CSV table of C-alpha atoms and ligand atoms in Angstrom, one decimal:
chain,number,residue,atom,x,y,z
A,1,UNK,CA,-26.4,10.5,-15.1
A,2,UNK,CA,-25.1,9.6,-11.6
A,3,UNK,CA,-23.8,6.0,-12.0
A,4,UNK,CA,-20.8,6.3,-9.6
A,5,UNK,CA,-20.5,4.5,-6.3
A,6,UNK,CA,-20.3,7.1,-3.3
A,7,UNK,CA,-17.5,6.3,-0.7
A,8,UNK,CA,-16.8,8.2,2.6
A,9,UNK,CA,-13.1,9.1,3.3
A,10,UNK,CA,-11.9,10.4,6.7
A,11,UNK,CA,-8.7,12.3,7.7
A,12,UNK,CA,-5.5,10.2,8.3
A,13,UNK,CA,-5.4,12.0,11.8
A,14,UNK,CA,-8.8,10.2,12.6
A,15,UNK,CA,-6.8,6.8,12.8
A,16,UNK,CA,-4.5,5.4,15.6
A,17,UNK,CA,-1.6,3.2,14.5
A,18,UNK,CA,-0.4,1.1,17.5
A,19,UNK,CA,2.2,-1.8,17.4
A,20,UNK,CA,2.2,-5.5,18.1
A,21,UNK,CA,4.6,-8.5,17.7
A,22,UNK,CA,6.4,-9.1,14.4
A,23,UNK,CA,4.4,-11.1,11.7
A,24,UNK,CA,6.8,-13.4,9.6
A,25,UNK,CA,6.2,-14.4,5.9
A,26,UNK,CA,5.6,-18.1,5.2
A,27,UNK,CA,8.5,-17.9,2.7
A,28,UNK,CA,12.1,-16.9,3.6
A,29,UNK,CA,13.0,-16.1,-0.2
A,30,UNK,CA,11.6,-15.7,-3.8
A,31,UNK,CA,13.0,-19.2,-4.5
A,32,UNK,CA,11.1,-20.7,-1.4
A,33,UNK,CA,7.9,-18.7,-2.4
A,34,UNK,CA,7.8,-20.3,-5.9
A,35,UNK,CA,8.7,-23.8,-4.6
A,36,UNK,CA,5.8,-23.8,-2.1
A,37,UNK,CA,3.4,-22.5,-4.9
A,38,UNK,CA,4.5,-25.5,-7.1
A,39,UNK,CA,4.0,-28.0,-4.1
A,40,UNK,CA,0.5,-26.6,-3.2
A,41,UNK,CA,-0.6,-26.4,-6.9
A,42,UNK,CA,0.0,-30.2,-7.2
A,43,UNK,CA,-2.1,-30.8,-4.0
A,44,UNK,CA,-5.0,-28.3,-4.1
A,45,UNK,CA,-4.7,-26.5,-7.5
A,46,UNK,CA,-4.7,-22.7,-8.3
A,47,UNK,CA,-3.7,-20.4,-5.5
A,48,UNK,CA,-6.5,-17.9,-4.5
A,49,UNK,CA,-5.4,-14.6,-2.9
A,50,UNK,CA,-7.4,-11.5,-1.8
A,51,UNK,CA,-6.2,-8.0,-1.1
A,52,UNK,CA,-7.8,-4.9,0.5
A,53,UNK,CA,-7.6,-1.3,-0.6
A,54,UNK,CA,-8.0,1.1,2.4
A,55,UNK,CA,-8.4,4.8,1.6
A,56,UNK,CA,-8.0,8.0,3.8
A,57,UNK,CA,-7.5,11.7,3.0
A,58,UNK,CA,-5.5,14.7,4.4
A,59,UNK,CA,-6.7,18.1,3.3
A,60,UNK,CA,-9.0,16.4,0.6
A,61,UNK,CA,-6.1,14.5,-1.1
A,62,UNK,CA,-6.8,10.7,-1.2
A,63,UNK,CA,-4.1,8.3,0.0
A,64,UNK,CA,-3.9,4.4,-0.1
A,65,UNK,CA,-2.6,2.6,3.1
A,66,UNK,CA,0.3,0.4,2.2
A,67,UNK,CA,2.3,-2.1,4.4
A,68,UNK,CA,6.1,-1.6,4.1
A,69,UNK,CA,8.3,-4.6,5.2
A,70,UNK,CA,11.3,-2.8,7.0
A,71,UNK,CA,12.6,-0.5,4.2
A,72,UNK,CA,12.0,-3.1,1.4
A,73,UNK,CA,8.7,-4.3,-0.4
A,74,UNK,CA,5.3,-2.5,-0.4
A,75,UNK,CA,2.2,-4.7,-0.2
A,76,UNK,CA,-1.5,-4.4,0.3
A,77,UNK,CA,-3.1,-6.0,3.4
A,78,UNK,CA,-4.3,-9.5,2.3
A,79,UNK,CA,-3.1,-13.1,1.7
A,80,UNK,CA,-4.0,-16.7,0.8
A,81,UNK,CA,-7.5,-18.2,1.1
A,82,UNK,CA,-7.9,-21.8,2.4
A,83,UNK,CA,-9.7,-24.4,0.2
A,84,UNK,CA,-13.5,-23.8,0.1
A,85,UNK,CA,-13.1,-20.4,2.0
A,86,UNK,CA,-15.5,-17.5,0.9
A,87,UNK,CA,-13.4,-14.6,-0.6
A,88,UNK,CA,-15.0,-11.8,1.5
A,89,UNK,CA,-15.0,-13.7,4.8
A,90,UNK,CA,-11.4,-14.7,4.0
A,91,UNK,CA,-10.2,-11.0,3.4
A,92,UNK,CA,-11.9,-10.0,6.7
A,93,UNK,CA,-10.0,-12.9,8.5
A,94,UNK,CA,-6.6,-11.8,6.9
A,95,UNK,CA,-7.0,-8.1,7.6
A,96,UNK,CA,-7.8,-9.0,11.3
A,97,UNK,CA,-4.7,-11.2,11.5
A,98,UNK,CA,-2.5,-8.3,10.2
A,99,UNK,CA,-4.1,-5.1,11.7
A,100,UNK,CA,-6.5,-6.4,14.4
A,101,UNK,CA,-6.2,-5.2,18.0
A,102,UNK,CA,-3.9,-6.5,20.9
A,103,UNK,CA,-7.0,-5.9,23.3
A,104,UNK,CA,-9.2,-8.2,21.0
A,105,UNK,CA,-11.9,-5.6,20.1
A,106,UNK,CA,-13.2,-6.3,16.6
A,107,UNK,CA,-12.8,-4.0,13.6
A,108,UNK,CA,-16.0,-3.6,11.6
A,109,UNK,CA,-14.7,-4.3,8.1
A,110,UNK,CA,-17.1,-3.2,5.3
A,111,UNK,CA,-16.5,-4.8,1.9
A,112,UNK,CA,-19.0,-4.1,-0.9
A,113,UNK,CA,-16.9,-3.4,-4.2
A,114,UNK,CA,-14.6,-5.5,-6.5
A,115,UNK,CA,-11.7,-3.3,-7.7
A,116,UNK,CA,-10.0,-5.9,-10.1
A,117,UNK,CA,-8.7,-9.4,-10.9
A,118,UNK,CA,-5.1,-10.5,-11.7
A,119,UNK,CA,-3.7,-13.8,-13.0
A,120,UNK,CA,-0.3,-15.4,-12.7
A,121,UNK,CA,0.3,-17.9,-15.7
A,122,UNK,CA,3.5,-19.5,-14.4
A,123,UNK,CA,5.6,-20.1,-11.1
A,124,UNK,CA,7.3,-16.7,-12.0
A,125,UNK,CA,6.7,-13.0,-11.0
A,126,UNK,CA,4.6,-11.9,-14.1
A,127,UNK,CA,0.9,-11.1,-13.4
A,128,UNK,CA,-1.8,-9.8,-15.9
A,129,UNK,CA,-5.3,-8.2,-15.6
A,130,UNK,CA,-6.7,-11.1,-17.8
A,131,UNK,CA,-5.8,-14.9,-18.5
A,132,UNK,CA,-3.0,-14.7,-21.2
A,133,UNK,CA,-3.3,-16.5,-24.6
A,134,UNK,CA,-2.8,-20.3,-24.5
A,135,UNK,CA,-3.0,-20.4,-20.6
A,136,UNK,CA,-5.5,-23.1,-19.4
A,137,UNK,CA,-4.1,-23.7,-15.9
A,138,UNK,CA,-3.2,-20.3,-14.2
A,139,UNK,CA,-1.1,-20.8,-11.1
A,140,UNK,CA,-2.7,-17.9,-9.0
A,141,UNK,CA,-5.9,-15.8,-9.1
A,142,UNK,CA,-5.7,-12.5,-7.1
A,143,UNK,CA,-8.9,-10.5,-6.3
A,144,UNK,CA,-8.8,-6.8,-5.1
A,145,UNK,CA,-11.6,-5.2,-3.0
A,146,UNK,CA,-12.3,-1.7,-1.7
A,147,UNK,CA,-12.5,-1.7,2.2
A,148,UNK,CA,-14.8,1.2,3.4
A,149,UNK,CA,-13.2,2.4,6.8
A,150,UNK,CA,-15.2,3.6,9.8
A,151,UNK,CA,-14.9,7.3,10.9
A,152,UNK,CA,-12.3,6.3,13.5
A,153,UNK,CA,-10.3,3.1,14.2
A,154,UNK,CA,-7.1,1.8,16.1
A,155,UNK,CA,-4.9,-0.5,14.0
A,156,UNK,CA,-2.1,-2.7,15.5
A,157,UNK,CA,0.8,-2.7,13.0
A,158,UNK,CA,3.2,-5.7,13.4
A,159,UNK,CA,6.5,-4.3,14.7
A,160,UNK,CA,8.5,-5.5,11.5
A,161,UNK,CA,6.0,-3.4,9.3
A,162,UNK,CA,5.1,0.4,8.9
A,163,UNK,CA,1.6,1.4,7.7
A,164,UNK,CA,2.3,4.3,5.2
A,165,UNK,CA,-0.2,6.6,3.5
A,166,UNK,CA,0.7,7.0,-0.3
A,167,UNK,CA,-0.9,9.8,-2.3
A,168,UNK,CA,-2.3,8.7,-5.7
A,169,UNK,CA,0.3,10.9,-7.7
A,170,UNK,CA,3.2,8.9,-6.2
A,171,UNK,CA,1.7,5.5,-7.4
A,172,UNK,CA,0.7,6.7,-10.9
A,173,UNK,CA,3.1,5.5,-13.7
A,174,UNK,CA,5.4,4.1,-10.9
A,175,UNK,CA,5.5,0.3,-11.6
A,176,UNK,CA,9.3,0.2,-10.9
A,177,UNK,CA,8.5,1.5,-7.4
A,178,UNK,CA,5.3,-0.4,-6.6
A,179,UNK,CA,4.7,-3.0,-9.3
A,180,UNK,CA,1.9,-3.3,-11.8
A,181,UNK,CA,-1.1,-3.8,-9.4
A,182,UNK,CA,-0.4,-0.9,-6.9
A,183,UNK,CA,0.7,1.5,-9.7
A,184,UNK,CA,-2.6,1.0,-11.5
A,185,UNK,CA,-4.8,1.9,-8.3
A,186,UNK,CA,-5.2,5.6,-9.4
A,187,UNK,CA,-6.9,4.4,-12.6
A,188,UNK,CA,-9.0,1.7,-10.8
A,189,UNK,CA,-10.2,4.3,-8.0
A,190,UNK,CA,-11.1,7.1,-10.5
A,191,UNK,CA,-14.7,5.7,-11.0
A,192,UNK,CA,-15.6,6.4,-7.3
A,193,UNK,CA,-17.3,9.5,-5.9
A,194,UNK,CA,-15.2,10.2,-2.8
A,195,UNK,CA,-16.8,12.3,0.0
A,196,UNK,CA,-14.0,14.2,2.1
A,197,UNK,CA,-15.4,14.2,5.7
B,201,LIG,ZN1,-7.5,20.7,5.5
B,202,LIG,ZN1,-9.4,-17.4,-12.0
């Protein structure tokens, strides 16, 4: 009886958060977001997204790194795969596009664990951790992965975003604040054996 995955965590003060130019969303509104999902579904089928969960600690208290757009939405680092693109290579590409350095030194992203799977049945906000009853053509499949960080790193945060460290207690039972995927991270992370370096 030791069946848990062992993960190294480092202090938040081990990481440098630099700045770079703004990164703009492909969609200028909720309505434009669901119009483009409908157009691409007709051309290339189900949307495939990938998201990274990056963990740090301070004084042995785990925190998840979240992207905050101005003072509005919280999001995980991630995005949309291209057709025929590998999911793990894709997440590594997207995390470099978002947080990768202005001096063009490469982060060594380490991805070895699936956290979870969510499905969007319609061109509407609702997402579920399973394909709902009667749904044969889901509109989006989202995959979450645990990203093991190095001991130290410099991240370049686009100037229209803040990288924030959220403690697990603040996420727990807080779907109104964070939505159904981020608010269930405490439950999804509980299986790991974290080492507080
Ligand atoms: Zn301490
Ligand atoms: Zn699927």
